[PDB]
Amino acid sequence: EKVTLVRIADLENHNNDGGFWTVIDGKVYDIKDFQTQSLTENSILAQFAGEDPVVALEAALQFEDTRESMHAFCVGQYLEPDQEGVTIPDLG
Numbered sequence: 001e002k003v004t005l006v007r008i009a010d011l012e013n014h015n016n017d018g019g020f021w022t023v024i025d026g027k028v029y030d031i032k033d034f035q036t037q038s039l040t041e042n043s044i045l046a047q048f049a050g051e052d053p054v055v056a057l058e059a060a061l062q063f064e065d066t067r068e069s070m071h072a073f074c075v076g077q078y079l080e081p082d083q084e085g086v087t088i089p090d091l092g
Contacts (some may be wrong), residue, residue, distance in 0.1 A: 004076025011078075021075065022054050029057055029073040037069075044069055 006028040011021055020032040035053040038045035044066045048056035057073070060066035 005079045006076045007081060023078045024057060025061060026078055028075045028078045029070065030075055031057065034073050
């Protein structure tokens with residue numbers, strides 16, 4: 001219904017809160033909880049447990065089965081401070 005806009009500030013300070021996040025596909029996913037599920041047998045991420053959780057997230061986005069649980073890890077959409085604070089002329 002509403003777009004959760006995560007900033008670079010949120011990304012940094014929430015890591016100190018104990019929730020390590022990352023920015024992929026213009027979205028912010030919870031890697032701390034991701035890797036916990038990856039350590040759990042019979043979980044879709046247990047096959048990606050030998051891979052780095054941030055890279056394994058991309059493989060999980062790519063695969064149609066595993067992208068369904070990515071909806072659970074996606075805290076919100078990432079939007080940069082600079083990105084909405086600039087007027088862009090039609091030249092790109």
